[PDB]
Each structure stands twice: as structure tokens, then as C-alpha cells.
């Protein structure tokens, strides 16, 4: 990692909880990562948000 390649938390949008954490390069991807992922709290697929760790 680096100050640019940062790890962050992935927050499921419909359960208000964070389920994951991955890598992204803020120079190549400064946008907020929003990607599908499974949420056991909702028991179904949900789109996930980029939230600061």
C-alpha cells in the first residue's frame, strides 16, 4: 500500500453496516467505490459504498 494506494471499508447501503475492505488507488480511482456485494444482515445482494476506514 501507500498514501495513494489506500485501504477502505465497504459499507452496504441498505443495512447501514460495513461488510468488506479492499484496495484502490486514489490517483487512478479517486471516485467513491460502489460495488455489488453480499450482505448477510439483509440476506441478499446489495450495492456497497466507499467509506473511510
Partner RNA sequence: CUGACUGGGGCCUGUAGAGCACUGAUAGGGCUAGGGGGCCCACCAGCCUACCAAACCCUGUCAAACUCCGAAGGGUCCCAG
Partner RNA sequence: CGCCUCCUAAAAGGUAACGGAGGCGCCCAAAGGUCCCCUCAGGCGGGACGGAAAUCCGCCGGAGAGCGCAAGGGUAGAAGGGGGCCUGACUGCGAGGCCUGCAAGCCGAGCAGGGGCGAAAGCCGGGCCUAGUGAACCGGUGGUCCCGUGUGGAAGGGCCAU
Partner RNA sequence: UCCCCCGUGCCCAUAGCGGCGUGGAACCACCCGUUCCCAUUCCGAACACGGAAGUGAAACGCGCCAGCGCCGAUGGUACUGGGCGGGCGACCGCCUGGGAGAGUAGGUCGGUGCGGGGGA
Which residue, chain included where needed, has cell 480511482?
29
Within a 10 A sphere around the Cβ of 33, how many other Cβ atoms? 13
Can you name the residues that pair with 10 across neighbouring β-strands? 20, 50
* Residue 30 found at the interface with RNA (CB under 7 A): no
Extended beta strands in 1-53, E state: 5-12, 18-25, 35-39, 44-51
* Residue 7 found at the interface with RNA (CB under 7 A): yes
Q: Minimal distance in Å, beta carbon 32 to RNA?
A: 11
Which residues of this chain interact with Zn ion, rule CB under 5 A? 12, 14-15, 39, 42, 46
Which residues of this chain interact with RNA, rule CB under 7 A? 1-2, 4-5, 7, 9, 16-25, 27-29, 33, 35-38, 40-41, 43-45, 53
Amino acid at each position: 500500500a501507500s498514501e495513494v494506494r489506500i485501504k477502505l471499508l465497504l459499507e452496504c447501503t441498505e443495512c447501514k453496516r460495513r461488510n468488506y475492505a479492499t484496495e484502490k488507488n486514489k490517483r487512478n480511482t479517486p471516485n467513491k467505490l460502489e460495488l455489488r456485494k453480499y450482505c448477510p444482515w439483509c440476506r441478499k445482494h446489495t450495492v456497497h459504498r466507499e467509506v473511510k476506514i
